[PDB]
Amino acid sequence: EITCQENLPFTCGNTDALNSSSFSSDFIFGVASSAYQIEGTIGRGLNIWDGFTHRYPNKSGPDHGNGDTTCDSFSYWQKDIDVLDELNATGYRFSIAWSRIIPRGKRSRGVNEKGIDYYHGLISGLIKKGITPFVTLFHWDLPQTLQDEYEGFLDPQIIDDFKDYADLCFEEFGDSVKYWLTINQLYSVPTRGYGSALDAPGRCSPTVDPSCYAGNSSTEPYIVAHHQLLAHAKVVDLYRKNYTHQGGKIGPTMITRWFLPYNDTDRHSIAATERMKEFFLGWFMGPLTNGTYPQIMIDTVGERLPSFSPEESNLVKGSYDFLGLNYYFTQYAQPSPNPVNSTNHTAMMDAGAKLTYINASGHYIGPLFEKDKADSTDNIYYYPKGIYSVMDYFKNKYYNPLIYVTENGISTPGDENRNQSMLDYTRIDYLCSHLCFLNKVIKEKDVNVKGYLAWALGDNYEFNKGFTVRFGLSYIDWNNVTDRDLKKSGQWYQSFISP
Amino acid sequence: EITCQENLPFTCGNTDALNSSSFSSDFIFGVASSAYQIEGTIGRGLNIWDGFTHRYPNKSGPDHGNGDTTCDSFSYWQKDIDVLDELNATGYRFSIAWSRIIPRGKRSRGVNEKGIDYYHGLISGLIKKGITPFVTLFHWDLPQTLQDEYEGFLDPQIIDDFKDYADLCFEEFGDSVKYWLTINQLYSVPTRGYGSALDAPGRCSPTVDPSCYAGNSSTEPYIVAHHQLLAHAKVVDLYRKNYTHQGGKIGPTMITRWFLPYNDTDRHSIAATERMKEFFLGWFMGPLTNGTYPQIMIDTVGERLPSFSPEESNLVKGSYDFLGLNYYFTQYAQPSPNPVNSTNHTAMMDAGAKLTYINASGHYIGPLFEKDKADSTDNIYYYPKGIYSVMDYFKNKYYNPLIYVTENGISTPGDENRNQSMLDYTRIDYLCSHLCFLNKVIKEKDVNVKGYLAWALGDNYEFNKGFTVRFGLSYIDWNNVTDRDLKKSGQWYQSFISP
Ligand SMILES: *[C@@H]1O[C@H](CO)[C@@H](O[C@@H]2O[C@H](CO)[C@@H](O[C@@H]3O[C@H](CO[C@H]4O[C@H](CO)[C@@H](O)[C@H](O)[C@@H]4O)[C@@H](O)[C@H](O[C@H]4O[C@H](CO)[C@@H](O)[C@H](O)[C@@H]4O)[C@@H]3O[C@@H]3OC[C@@H](O)[C@H](O)[C@H]3O)[C@H](O)[C@H]2NC(C)=O)[C@H](O[C@@H]2O[C@@H](C)[C@@H](O)[C@@H](O)[C@@H]2O)[C@H]1NC(C)=O
Ligand SMILES: *[C@@H]1O[C@H](CO)[C@@H](O[C@@H]2O[C@H](CO)[C@@H](O[C@@H]3O[C@H](CO[C@H]4O[C@H](CO)[C@@H](O)[C@H](O)[C@@H]4O)[C@@H](O)[C@H](O[C@H]4O[C@H](CO)[C@@H](O)[C@H](O)[C@@H]4O)[C@@H]3O[C@@H]3OC[C@@H](O)[C@H](O)[C@H]3O)[C@H](O)[C@H]2NC(C)=O)[C@H](O[C@@H]2O[C@@H](C)[C@@H](O)[C@@H](O)[C@@H]2O)[C@H]1NC(C)=O
Ligand SMILES: *[C@@H]1O[C@H](CO)[C@@H](O[C@@H]2O[C@H](CO)[C@@H](O[C@@H]3O[C@H](CO)[C@@H](O)[C@H](O)[C@@H]3O[C@@H]3OC[C@@H](O)[C@H](O)[C@H]3O)[C@H](O)[C@H]2NC(C)=O)[C@H](O[C@@H]2O[C@@H](C)[C@@H](O)[C@@H](O)[C@@H]2O)[C@H]1NC(C)=O
Ligand SMILES: *[C@@H]1O[C@H](CO)[C@@H](O[C@@H]2O[C@H](CO)[C@@H](O[C@@H]3O[C@H](CO)[C@@H](O)[C@H](O)[C@@H]3O[C@@H]3OC[C@@H](O)[C@H](O)[C@H]3O)[C@H](O)[C@H]2NC(C)=O)[C@H](O[C@@H]2O[C@@H](C)[C@@H](O)[C@@H](O)[C@@H]2O)[C@H]1NC(C)=O
Numbered sequence: 001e002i003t004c005q006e007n008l009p010f011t012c013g014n015t016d017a018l019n020s021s022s023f024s025s026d027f028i029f030g031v032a033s034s035a036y037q038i039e040g041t042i043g044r045g046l047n048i049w050d051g052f053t054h055r056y057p058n059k060s061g062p063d064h065g066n067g068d069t070t071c072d073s074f075s076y077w078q079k080d081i082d083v084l085d086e087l088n089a090t091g092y093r094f095s096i097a098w099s100r101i102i103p104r105g106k107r108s109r110g111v112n113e114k115g116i117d118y119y120h121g122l123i124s125g126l127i128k129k130g131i132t133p134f135v136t137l138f139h140w141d142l143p144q145t146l147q148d149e150y151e152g153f154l155d156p157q158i159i160d161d162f163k164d165y166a167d168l169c170f171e172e173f174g175d176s177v178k179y180w181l182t183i184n185q186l187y188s189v190p191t192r193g194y195g196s197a198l199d200a201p202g203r204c205s206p207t208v209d210p211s212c213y214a215g216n217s218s219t220e221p222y223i224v225a226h227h228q229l230l231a232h233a234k235v236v237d238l239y240r241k242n243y244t245h246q247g248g249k250i251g252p253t254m255i256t257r258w259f260l261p262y263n264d265t266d267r268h269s270i271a272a273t274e275r276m277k278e279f280f281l282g283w284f285m286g287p288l289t290n291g292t293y294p295q296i297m298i299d300t301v302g303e304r305l306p307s308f309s310p311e312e313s314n315l316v317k318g319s320y321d322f323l324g325l326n327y328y329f330t331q332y333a334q335p336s337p338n339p340v341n342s343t344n345h346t347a348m349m350d351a352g353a354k355l356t357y358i359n360a361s362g363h364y365i366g367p368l369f370e371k372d373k374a375d376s377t378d379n380i381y382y383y384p385k386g387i388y389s390v391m392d393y394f395k396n397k398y399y400n401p402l403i404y405v406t407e408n409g410i411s412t413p414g415d416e417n418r419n420q421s422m423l424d425y426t427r428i429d430y431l432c433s434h435l436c437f438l439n440k441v442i443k444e445k446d447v448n449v450k451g452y453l454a455w456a457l458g459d460n461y462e463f464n465k466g467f468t469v470r471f472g473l474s475y476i477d478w479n480n481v482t483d484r485d486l487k488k489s490g491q492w493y494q495s496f497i498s499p
Numbered sequence: 500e501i502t503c504q505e506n507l508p509f510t511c512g513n514t515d516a517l518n519s520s521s522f523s524s525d526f527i528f529g530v531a532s533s534a535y536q537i538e539g540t541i542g543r544g545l546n547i548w549d550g551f552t553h554r555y556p557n558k559s560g561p562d563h564g565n566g567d568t569t570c571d572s573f574s575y576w577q578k579d580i581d582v583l584d585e586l587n588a589t590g591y592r593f594s595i596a597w598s599r600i601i602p603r604g605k606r607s608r609g610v611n612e613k614g615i616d617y618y619h620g621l622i623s624g625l626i627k628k629g630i631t632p633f634v635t636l637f638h639w640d641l642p643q644t645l646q647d648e649y650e651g652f653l654d655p656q657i658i659d660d661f662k663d664y665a666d667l668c669f670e671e672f673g674d675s676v677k678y679w680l681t682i683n684q685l686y687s688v689p690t691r692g693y694g695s696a697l698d699a700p701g702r703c704s705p706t707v708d709p710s711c712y713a714g715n716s717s718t719e720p721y722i723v724a725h726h727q728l729l730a731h732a733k734v735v736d737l738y739r740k741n742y743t744h745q746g747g748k749i750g751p752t753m754i755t756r757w758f759l760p761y762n763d764t765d766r767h768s769i770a771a772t773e774r775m776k777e778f779f780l781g782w783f784m785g786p787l788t789n790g791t792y793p794q795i796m797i798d799t800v801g802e803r804l805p806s807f808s809p810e811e812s813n814l815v816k817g818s819y820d821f822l823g824l825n826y827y828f829t830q831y832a833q834p835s836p837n838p839v840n841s842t843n844h845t846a847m848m849d850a851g852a853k854l855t856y857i858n859a860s861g862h863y864i865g866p867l868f869e870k871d872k873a874d875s876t877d878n879i880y881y882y883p884k885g886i887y888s889v890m891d892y893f894k895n896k897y898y899n900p901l902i903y904v905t906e907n908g909i910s911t912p913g914d915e916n917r918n919q920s921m922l923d924y925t926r927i928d929y930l931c932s933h934l935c936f937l938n939k940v941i942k943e944k945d946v947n948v949k950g951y952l953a954w955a956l957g958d959n960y961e962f963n964k965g966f967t968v969r970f971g972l973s974y975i976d977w978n979n980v981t982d983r984d985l986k987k988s989g990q991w992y993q994s995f996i997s998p
């Protein structure tokens with residue numbers, strides 16, 4: 001019988017009590033990264049994250065930091081493999097930068113052979129050390145040309161350009177890569193990129209953020225989300241029809257949260273909690289499992305919600321071999337009005353829910369996750385049981401999928417000095433507490449989870465945050481990025497993996 | 500009778516001997532800048548200089564510096580006007596960043612109203628202080644989207660996209676701006692951008708530079724040069740046909756050099772000197788004055804040299820109200836082979852000339868201009884009489900044009916400390932020695948020169964060089980770019996202007 005802790009102090013850092021042998025022998029353990037965040041711009045074309053961080057430097061991070069050099073994994077990829085080798089990792093999730101292999105976006109314009117060679121070297125080096133690559137095709141870094149031609153995922157032209165890029169990736173790398181992820185966190189770009197404009201490309205309605213160059217926060221998230229689903233499904237069909245000989249698997253990446261009622265005896269809060277599940281997860285999972293959006297979304301969003309043709313619905317339904325689930329935290333939900341006529345209306349308001357980390361009785365959900373220096377009342381708190389709740393929900397609601405946990409992690413402040421940053425016991429506590437729950441849900445509920453990839457390998461540029469937060473299991477000195485030195489968390493994870 | 504000095508020491512820094520009253524009363528004196536070099540990327544789209552400096556950081560400068568923030572004239576434009584006001588300047592040359600007003604390149608995709616407002620504020624502030632703006636439409640910073648769509652000036656599609664951008668500039672600004680420059684230094688982009696790949700977009704033949712993404716150094720400079728002429732002429736025709744009501748003038752910017760024989764009694768060196776004039780100046784000036792390329796170029800370059808149709812020739816011939824002439828230095832010329840079949844053949848070899856600053860008797864042409872730390876034998880030296888020789892040549896060969904000197908200046912090393920950098924007596928010597936010759940040629944030869952704009956207002960990002968050289972009359976501290984403090988040269992120029 002398995003007992004996991006929910007509140008400080010945790011005792012799961014003791015690898016006598018919890019380690020990789022606690023899981024099935026075939027279970028994959030590793031870490032994750034993404035190309036904009038680690039590589040640098042050397043050797044590639046420009047993408048919308050270059051464009052957004054440079055046009056809107058105060059949106060790049062409080063420090064105006066960006067991915068121009070970052071940890072220089074373009075130069076130092078072998079040091080990344082050395083970290084993974086130190087960990088005795090068996091998996092690594094990384095992303096391919098579209099702008100590194102097709103700098104001009106559209107494949108017919110030419111490929112960058114040196115870009116292709118970069119990834120071939122990485123992949124060969126991973127396999128040589130027994131590490132399974134899990135390769136994300138699109139981790140938000142769209143070639144800027146495509147955004148400038150047709151506004152990227154706002155336009156249906158993206159589908160064929162994405163398809164041709166994916167086709168290249170499978171042709172060049174698929175003899176060695178057997179686990180492909182299509183689009184990172186389906187919910188994020190529509191909402192943050194086209195709703196709040198916190199992320200690239202930075203579009204929104206004028207009174208949401210007057211700095212936005214264009215947009216409509218009420219309509220564009222739904223347009224973009226729909227095109228992401230269609231683009232995803234077209235690539236999954238190409239993979240499964242034309243690359244079956246490679247013997248690999250493909251799926252999307254979801255951002256997952258759990259939701260609990262703000263007041264668990266209030267029917268309105270209970271209803272807002274269930275709406276949130278449909279609006280946050282079901283927006284994509286409904287299409288992926290049924291070929292239709294959730295009914296609550298159909299009813300609420302009305303003419304703003306695009307339709308799938310019969311052909312499209314069939315393409316999108318069942319378009320995954322597995323799901324990559326990212327999980328960080330859980331929120332309480334309460335009702336909130338949805339003022340569809342307000343010039344500052346956003347798609348995110350359609351769920352009719354207000355999200356908090358404190359419930360109506362004043363209970364904070366768990367330990368501190370991310371301090372908000374500007375407003376402490378908006379600190380994020382985590383909830384280790386949430387990973388259990390999410391996985392059980394996916395099994396029960398979404399047809400018992402094969403799952404890999406493709407991100408899970410926690411930041412420490414960039415204001416900390418090196419010693420403080422290396423003594424990242426808060427990161428041990430977060431990671432172990434979630435792995436305890438993950439083990440528990442696999443044993444208790446028989447959820448088909450087959451690996452776990454902690455975010456992140458190393459400190460890197462974090463979207464929105466610059467270098468103001470560190471998420472790495474290994475530390476990077478921004479004055480001299482060559483080394484990646486295992487933190488306390490990295491050392492811990494090494495022992496968890498090989499106890 | 501006017502005597503000017505050619506060699507150190509100069510005595511023309513004494514404003515009793517040389518000052519603005521030495522020139523005609525209507526003569527314009529000022530300084531120059533360009534948008535990539537001064538503004539920063541805040542508030543604009545990305546261009547090929549962003550793309551090139553980030554893809555090829557070792558080509559951006561030895562320091563890997565770029566125009567991301569630079570002197571932040573986006574924020575600090577009023578400080579630029581304050582420098583000009585301190586100088587009692589009557590002119591200022593600046594450039595409009597295409598990517599700031601039409602971030603998506605093609606006008607039909609939308610305009611950036613905040614970009615437009617930036618320039619309106621600048622222009623209004625200049626006029627309010629009695630400063631004549633001289634506005635460059637294109638100072639090399641092509642929207643990256645256009646380079647990625649069709650390779651920019653390599654393709655005839657540039658002509659209409661450039662025309663529509665220029666049309667916007669004249670519509671929005673032409674009620675106040677009366678002096679327009681089309682393309683900066685016609686020779687430069689073809690040769691450096693498509694020949695040697697020292698500049699954006701960085702194309703060349705594979706054995707010229709294996710880092711280049713694509714190109715052909717033998718053919719593409721001629722293609723690009725031709726499209727620059729056609730694009731220029733289409734914009735001059737639009738201006739003169741649709742914007743005559745504004746009562747302004749338009750022209751191109753040429754880079755000028757003078758050429759002298761390496762051995763002045765050797766007919767082969769004399770011939771190479773005259774070839775150089777045709778290949779460096781005549782490449783563009785032949786079209787601009789006759790509608791045809793020079794015959795020596797027709798004969799040598801053969802099928803690599805594009806033809807003008809009768810319609811095109813008529814469009815390009817006479818396509819200027821004035822010429823903006825940049826002038827920095829003069830070279831000796833000697834013969835050199837032109838191996839048209841060598842896989843490393845470049846267009847620059849077609850002139851059949853090798854260029855030096857030392858003649859066959861071991862005479863260096865003048866004072867030091869730019870040290871080359873990597874190879875001192877390749878130091879650049881200047882030649883004040885060259886400005887006299889160039890202007891006289893333009894009068895005699897090219898039909899007595901109206902001329903404004905749109906750049907002239909000298910760098911000091913970025914390794915210098917602030918005190919050393921402020922004590923820029925070498926810059927006084929350069930500027931005064933050239934203004935003495937300029938006065939001389941106007942009086943002696945009656946060349947129609949009506950103003951002079953020194954490069955540069957302030958220290959900025961220099962193409963290719965990062966922040967390793969300083970050209971400003973005012974000093975900028977890279978740790979805190981707000982202030983622009985007049986150097987000794989700025990102080991001198993203030994007194995030259997108002998003696
Ligand atoms: C998994 O995907 C399934 C689809 O493959 C989902 O089932 C579809 O659910 C649709 C609702 O979302 C449902 O559509 C409705 O269909 C009604 C029946 O139409 C037929 O029969 C009528 C009576 O004989 C006849 O008049 C018609 O001509 C049809 O033959 C139809 O009456 C509904 O239209 C009315 O209501 C709408 C909404 O208020 C009005 O706008 C409209 O004027 C009219 O008054 C409605 O049809 C749709 O209307 C909106 C329009 O945009 C659509 O194009 C049009 O289709 C459809 O029957 C079923 N299909 C099947 C095959 O069952 C399923 O949803 C779950 O199950 C259904 C039954 C329903 O209970 C949903 O709430 C459920 O969530 C998906 N599963 C999940 C978990 O998402
Ligand atoms: C200012 O622009 C002027 C144009 O508006 C320049 O003058 C043009 O200069 C052209 C040479 O660049 C010259 O073209 C040649 O024309 C020859 C005469 O053709 C007519 O008459 C013939 C005899 O009766 C007849 O057979 C023809 O059918 C024509 O009616 C022609 O023979 C030449 O072709 C021979 O030589 C070429 C080159 O070796 C061979 O390739 C070819 O097979 C043939 O053996 C040549 O014609 C051109 O050939 C190359 C081709 O790509 C061109 O399309 C075709 O035109 C043309 O006559 C004149 N035009 C005028 C109106 O005078 C002028 O150049 C200066 O002046 C001219 C005369 C010449 O001396 C040049 O060197 C000068 O620089 C320009 N000024 C400057 C300063 O650049
Ligand atoms: C979790 O949600 C539950 C259910 O909503 C909250 O319990 C409810 O709290 C309401 C007050 O917010 C109670 O209604 C009040 O009842 C008093 C006494 O009769 C009356 O004087 C008030 O005006 C009000 O009555 C409502 O007025 C508006 C009408 O539209 C509506 O019909 C009236 O009922 C309500 O009775 C109560 N429901 C139940 C089943 O207990 C609960 O709030 C917490 O517990 C209640 C018992 C009370 O102590 C609250 O102060 C306390 O906040 C909420 N829990 C938390 C922690 O917020
Ligand atoms: C500026 O250019 C002039 C003209 O080219 C240079 O003057 C020429 O220099 C040539 C040597 O580089 C002289 O030719 C030599 O003459 C001697 C004596 O007869 C002979 O023994 C040599 O082999 C050579 O003769 C040539 O061999 C190759 C044949 O294809 C050709 O037909 C032969 O002539 C040449 O006479 C001379 N011309 C004139 C008009 O004076 C000049 O070079 C400088 O001055 C000359 C006088 C001599 O002192 C050179 O050493 C000295 O460099 C050159 N100036 C500079 C500074 O380089």
Ligand SMILES: *[C@@H]1O[C@H](CO)[C@@H](O[C@@H]2O[C@H](CO)[C@@H](O)[C@H](O)[C@H]2NC(C)=O)[C@H](O)[C@H]1NC(C)=O
Pocket residue numbers: 205206215216217218219303304343
């Ligand atoms: C977002 O786009 C939507 C849809 O084009 C706009 O909502 C329309 O608003 C107009 C004018 O108020 C109304 O006639 C329609 O009834 C609306 N259609 C729908 C489906 O709601 C909305 O105004 C745009 N928002 C902004 C800020 O531009």
Ligand SMILES: *[C@@H]1O[C@H](CO)[C@@H](O[C@@H]2O[C@H](CO)[C@@H](O)[C@H](O)[C@H]2NC(C)=O)[C@H](O)[C@H]1NC(C)=O
Pocket residue numbers: 055056057058210211212542613
């Ligand atoms: C962040 O930078 C943006 C420019 O990218 C600034 O956005 C201005 O935002 C204000 C406040 O809403 C508007 O009224 C202006 O119209 C915006 N200007 C532009 C050019 O978009 C913003 O001020 C900066 N934020 C902070 C906190 O300094």
Ligand SMILES: *[C@@H]1O[C@H](CO)[C@@H](O[C@@H]2O[C@H](CO)[C@@H](O)[C@H](O)[C@H]2NC(C)=O)[C@H](O)[C@H]1NC(C)=O
Pocket residue numbers: 261262263264265359360361362363
């Ligand atoms: C706020 O959250 C707290 C903690 O989860 C809930 O308090 C638990 O409530 C259960 C059922 O009443 C009790 O058995 C536990 O003892 C409570 N735990 C603690 C730590 O107090 C609380 O009910 C939530 N409040 C609302 C309004 O939903």
Ligand SMILES: *[C@@H]1O[C@H](CO)[C@@H](O[C@@H]2O[C@H](CO)[C@@H](O)[C@H](O)[C@H]2NC(C)=O)[C@H](O)[C@H]1NC(C)=O
Pocket residue numbers: 088497498
């Ligand atoms: C790397 O991980 C592998 C696999 O867990 C380690 O090999 C296992 O080591 C345990 C404990 O010694 C043995 O029970 C198993 O028999 C080994 N399994 C296999 C398949 O070889 C290996 O020791 C770890 N390496 C390092 C350097 O920690």
Ligand SMILES: *[C@@H]1O[C@H](CO)[C@@H](O[C@@H]2O[C@H](CO)[C@@H](O)[C@H](O)[C@H]2NC(C)=O)[C@H](O)[C@H]1NC(C)=O
Pocket residue numbers: 704705714715716717718802803842
């Ligand atoms: C530059 O482009 C030119 C023209 O396409 C190439 O020169 C041709 O070279 C081929 C193969 O040697 C020859 O058949 C033709 O005679 C040439 N045409 C001309 C006008 O010279 C040249 O090889 C390209 N250079 C590189 C480095 O790609």
Ligand SMILES: *[C@@H]1O[C@H](CO)[C@@H](O[C@@H]2O[C@H](CO)[C@@H](O)[C@H](O)[C@H]2NC(C)=O)[C@H](O)[C@H]1NC(C)=O
Pocket residue numbers: 043114554555556557709710711
């Ligand atoms: C400058 O950086 C470039 C990469 O942009 C390097 O160019 C390599 O150049 C060598 C030498 O010719 C070639 O053999 C390689 O094929 C090029 N690699 C790539 C990826 O283009 C160059 O080494 C760097 N220069 C210096 C002096 O360090």
Ligand SMILES: *[C@@H]1O[C@H](CO)[C@@H](O[C@@H]2O[C@H](CO)[C@@H](O)[C@H](O)[C@H]2NC(C)=O)[C@H](O)[C@H]1NC(C)=O
Pocket residue numbers: 760761762763764858859860861862
């Ligand atoms: C190299 O340049 C020097 C300087 O301009 C030339 O020397 C001048 O030559 C003239 C004519 O012979 C003499 O009157 C001057 O006295 C010379 N000046 C000096 C400073 O020596 C020289 O002729 C050039 N050499 C060649 C081969 O062209």
Ligand SMILES: *[C@@H]1O[C@H](CO)[C@@H](O[C@@H]2O[C@H](CO)[C@@H](O)[C@H](O)[C@H]2NC(C)=O)[C@H](O)[C@H]1NC(C)=O
Pocket residue numbers: 587996997
């Ligand atoms: C700015 O420049 C103007 C013009 O040269 C200066 O005004 C001239 O000043 C001289 C010397 O005092 C007089 O001879 C002229 O009569 C003035 N000309 C005009 C048209 O007013 C002015 O003094 C300079 N200002 C500063 C602050 O130096």
Ligand SMILES: CN(C)CCS/C(Cc1ccccc1)=N\OS(=O)(=O)O
Pocket residue numbers: 185187188191192255328370455462471
């Ligand atoms: C660590 N980094 C790679 C995470 C990617 S974003 C994320 C999860 C999250 C959000 C806020 C703070 C930390 C993590 N959620 O995305 S969102 O759309 O739900 O906001």
Ligand SMILES: CN(C)CCS/C(Cc1ccccc1)=N\OS(=O)(=O)O
Pocket residue numbers: 684686687690691754827869954961970
């Ligand atoms: C100062 N900066 C704005 C100058 C622009 S470039 C220049 C002139 C030159 C070249 C080398 C060194 C200094 C100046 N010449 O361009 S070129 O094509 O002749 O090389």
Ligand SMILES: *[C@@H]1O[C@H](CO)[C@@H](O)[C@H](O)[C@H]1NC(C)=O
Pocket residue numbers: 015016017018019020021022499
């Ligand atoms: C691994 O943890 C299990 C409990 O899940 C424990 O029984 C086992 O001994 C641990 N292994 C090692 C080497 O400590």
Ligand SMILES: *[C@@H]1O[C@H](CO)[C@@H](O)[C@H](O)[C@H]1NC(C)=O
Pocket residue numbers: 237238241242
């Ligand atoms: C498979 O590739 C073939 C060969 O190009 C192509 O014609 C076909 O449409 C592709 N099938 C897909 C994407 O399902």
Ligand SMILES: *[C@@H]1O[C@H](CO)[C@@H](O)[C@H](O)[C@H]1NC(C)=O
Pocket residue numbers: 342343344
């Ligand atoms: C949205 O607009 C409404 C109507 O003015 C306003 O009350 C509300 O505070 C606005 N929301 C935000 C987040 O600014």
Ligand SMILES: *[C@@H]1O[C@H](CO)[C@@H](O)[C@H](O)[C@H]1NC(C)=O
Pocket residue numbers: 480481482483
């Ligand atoms: C950068 O760090 C590396 C790895 O520790 C070290 O070997 C190298 O000397 C460092 N460079 C500088 C300038 O300190």
Ligand SMILES: *[C@@H]1O[C@H](CO)[C@@H](O)[C@H](O)[C@H]1NC(C)=O
Pocket residue numbers: 514515516517518519520521998
């Ligand atoms: C300006 O220079 C001229 C010589 O060109 C001289 O005669 C005049 O006095 C100078 N003006 C002043 C104020 O020094």
Ligand SMILES: *[C@@H]1O[C@H](CO)[C@@H](O)[C@H](O)[C@H]1NC(C)=O
Pocket residue numbers: 736737740741
């Ligand atoms: C002048 O503008 C008119 C109005 O658009 C246009 O039709 C015409 O072709 C332009 N003329 C030029 C570029 O010479």
